[PDB]
Design a protein around this nucleic acid. Structure first.
Lengths: 350, 340
DNA sequence: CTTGACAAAAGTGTTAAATTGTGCTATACTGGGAGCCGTCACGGATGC
DNA sequence: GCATCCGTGAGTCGAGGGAAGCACAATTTAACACTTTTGTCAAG
């Protein structure tokens, strides 16, 4: 209903309100010291999906190498933007480059460049440049008959990567048990492993790699940004109507006429909310009222056929979407599915 | 892409996840299986409920962006991290497995859209079918096994189609019909269509019943067709102007009409006047036995407990007072019209 | 106004039968489809 | 200065209009011998 009352109170345009409500852009509630393109992120800032993903999970990219060719970069080496990874491909961001699926392992026995072939159903269980004693496993497989072991002592070298993963992160070697786990979030100065010998030097998401037995912290911020009507409800709950009224009164003395008109409209809305005793966050529904069924009847006509109103269909759609959203949340569904279901719930309420 | 088109926006959102190669798919499935096994071992060792540990791992993986309160999640996480290296290894495996499960589910939304696009027009919208297929895809990821060397789409299509069909059977009708009955209705419609195209005319119930098989007659087919009748909207327009609707021609036959209330009041008044001629106690006996005071009929023993008299005398006095009322009605005929 | 039976209409347990709800199916399959101008004309309001 | 979005446009009447299976576990219903209470009829 133009002009939007929620947008008037929150100082969001109609386009911004629609984008936030229907899960098109995120809105920030706590930046947690997030820096976007060298510029600190501020509250009430709109983030697109890509910007939110970059700030929340970091930067990474996978380059698929052509079959047969061998990468010029080793596993666990730092690369810069524009550097050539394989003879035919070049990276686009600086970071640690990791072998995704090495197709061949070239172990060097001491008495001997014996090679072993890796297939899609086989996985490497040892890091690159590792000393392997006679008998230790090298490549694991579903069938033990094709499983690769070591004839004698040697050094395991990985070659022929299927693809290179370049991730902007920090790698920390460790020797003892790690104090953190995969998926946790760390800050500078937090302990990682070895009883404080290794500590995080930058924000990010922490993951432990037992194959390479190192701790990788992907550079990302624990930014608080949300979409939909829950973020708008949070903004309206955090609103201080007294302070907003005082600021609007102070801005009402601006020489510009358009500024005074905008201040007057916003202040009229604020005065209405203050005098009425209503709360702004009441404009977002947490419980949807249900009309009495006699006003939305399902009657039987003289012929035995049933006649029902469209409100029953709208209520049924709303209930189906709400129950399915509850089930999806209980199942830990991914963010895309949950976002789609929340958007459908909003559209059904509308 | 389009802010106003939900389907386009969903397709754009799912198009940002690259499709999984065979190696990536196998790695993710293996990681999910290893994570589930690690959760089982962690539950066996720490003695906690496997479901509780899986919920804690999932909450940690999904982060704080999701609304068991967070304090017990943190306590359980600290307890798991208090284990030695040989067990924190299984905790890490569980975390990686949960992350791999999330990645694997996120990468198969194109498959569910492709499956769901063939179920449109059967009572559910496109996006509802997509979300139900997403539920089926989650179940398929839960039950998928990579040891069999089959591709994920082969086993996931079964579950996605199952979920979509179950959702259509459960949510496509205003008056819900059980799944077995929905299957019966669909089979009956298929049989009717086949007979209609083979005979070059609309089949009667006898042919349809014969083609359905044993245990089917024309009566059962007619009852099933009557059951399969969807309710009609009360706001469906009648005429060419569309100003008039169905609900404008359906009388309300629940609330009594003014005539009915008036004749009920008249009958009550005349009955009260008729009971005046009776004795003080006999009128009370009849008004209690017939439920004219408390609203509900009493029994002879209950009226006796009220009056201290046995049941036989109560039935005798009620019969005598009823005979007296019949005599007065015969001598006056002021109560026969209300009998209809 | 009372017992002293007693036919019966009602209420009470289990059980076999329909009836209904739920899980599962392993070659591989991975971004929709109906759109479509006598687009209705015209003030009022917002907002760039 | 223009661009976009939104809400508005007589009344009464009638007339006809009206992907699927399959297996199995729960659950509900029907039915069925039995105990009842609930009416009755018989005289005291």
């Amino acid at each position: 209903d133009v002009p939007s009352k929620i947008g008037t109170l929150l100082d969001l345009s109609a386009t911004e309100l629609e984008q936030v409500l229907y899960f098109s852009k995120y809105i920030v509630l706590d930046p947690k010291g997030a820096i976007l393109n060298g510029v600190p992120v501020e509250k009430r800032q709109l983030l697109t999906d890509e910007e939110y993903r970059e700030l929340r999970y970091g930067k990474q990219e996978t380059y698929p190498l052509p079959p047969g060719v061998d990468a010029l970069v080793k596993d666990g080496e730092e690369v810069v933007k524009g550097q050539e990874l394989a003879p035919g491909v070049v990276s686009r961001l600086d970071g640690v480059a990791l072998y995704r699926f090495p197709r061949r392992v070239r172990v060097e026995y001491v008495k001997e460049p014996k090679d072993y072939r890796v297939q899609p159903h086989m996985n490497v269980v040892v890091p690159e440049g590792a000393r392997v004693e006679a008998g230790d496993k090298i490549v694991a497989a579903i069938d033990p008959e094709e499983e690769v072991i070591a004839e004698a002592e040697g050094v395991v070298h990985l070659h022929e990567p299927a693809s290179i993963l370049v991730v902007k992160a920090r790698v920390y070697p460790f020797e003892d048990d790690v104090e953190v786990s995969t998926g946790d979030r760390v800050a500078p100065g937090d302990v990682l492993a070895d009883g404080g010998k290794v500590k995080s030097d930058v924000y990010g998401r922490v993951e432990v790699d037992l194959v390479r037995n190192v701790v990788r912290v992907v550079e990302s911020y624990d930014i608080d940004a949300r979409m939909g009507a829950e973020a708008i409800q949070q903004l309206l709950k955090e609103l201080d109507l007294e302070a907003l009224e005082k600021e609007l009164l102070e801005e009402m003395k601006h020489p510009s006429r358009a500024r005074r008109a905008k201040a007057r409209k916003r202040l009229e809305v604020v005065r209405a909310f203050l005098d009425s005793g209503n709360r702004p966050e009441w404009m977002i529904l947490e419980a949807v009222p249900v009309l009495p069924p006699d006003l939305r009847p399902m009657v039987q006509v003289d012929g035995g056929r049933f006649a029902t109103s469209d409100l029953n269909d709208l209520y049924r759609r709303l209930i189906n979407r709400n129950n399915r959203l509850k089930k999806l949340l209980a199942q830990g569904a991914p963010e895309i599915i949950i976002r789609n279901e929340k958007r459908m719930l909003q559209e059904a309420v509308d | 892409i389009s802010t106003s088109d939900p389907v386009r926006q969903y397709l754009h959102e799912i198009g940002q996840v690259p499709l999984l190669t065979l190696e990536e798919e196998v790695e993710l499935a293996r990681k999910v299986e290893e994570g589930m096994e690690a959760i089982k071992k962690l539950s066996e060792i720490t003695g906690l409920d496997p479901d509780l540990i899986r919920e804690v791992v999932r909450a940690k993986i999904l982060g704080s962006a999701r609304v068991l309160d967070p304090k017990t999640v943190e306590e359980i996480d600290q307890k798991l991290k208090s284990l030695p290296k040989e067990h924190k290894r299984y905790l890490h495996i569980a975390r990686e497995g949960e992350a791999a499960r999330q990645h694997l589910i996120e990468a198969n939304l194109r498959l569910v859209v492709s499956i769901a696009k063939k179920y449109t027009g059967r009572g559910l919208s496109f996006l509802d079918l997509i979300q139900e297929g997403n539920q089926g895809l989650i179940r398929a990821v839960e039950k998928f096994e990579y040891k069999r060397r089959f591709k994920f789409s082969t086993y996931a299509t079964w579950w996605i189609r199952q979920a979509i069909n179950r959702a259509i059977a459960d949510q496509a009708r205003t008056i819900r019909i059980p799944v077995h009955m929905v299957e019966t209705i669909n089979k009956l419609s298929r049989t009717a269509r086949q007979l209609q195209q083979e005979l070059g005319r609309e089949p009667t119930y006898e042919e349809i019943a014969e083609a359905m098989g044993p245990g089917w007659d024309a009566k059962r087919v007619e009852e099933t067709l009557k059951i399969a009748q969807e309710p009609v909207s009360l706001e469906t327009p009648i005429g060419d102007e569309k100003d008039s609707f169905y609900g404008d021609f359906i009388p309300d036959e629940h609330l009594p009409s003014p005539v009915d209330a008036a004749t009920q009041s008249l009958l009550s008044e005349e009955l009260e006047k008729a009971l005046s001629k009776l004795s003080e106690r006999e009128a009370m006996v009849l008004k209690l036995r017939k439920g004219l005071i408390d609203g509900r009929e009493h029994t002879l023993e209950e009226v006796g407990a009220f009056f201290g008299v046995t049941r036989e005398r109560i039935r005798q006095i009620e019969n005598k007072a009823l005979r007296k009322l019949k005599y007065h009605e015969s001598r006056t005929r002021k109560l026969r019209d209300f009998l209809d």
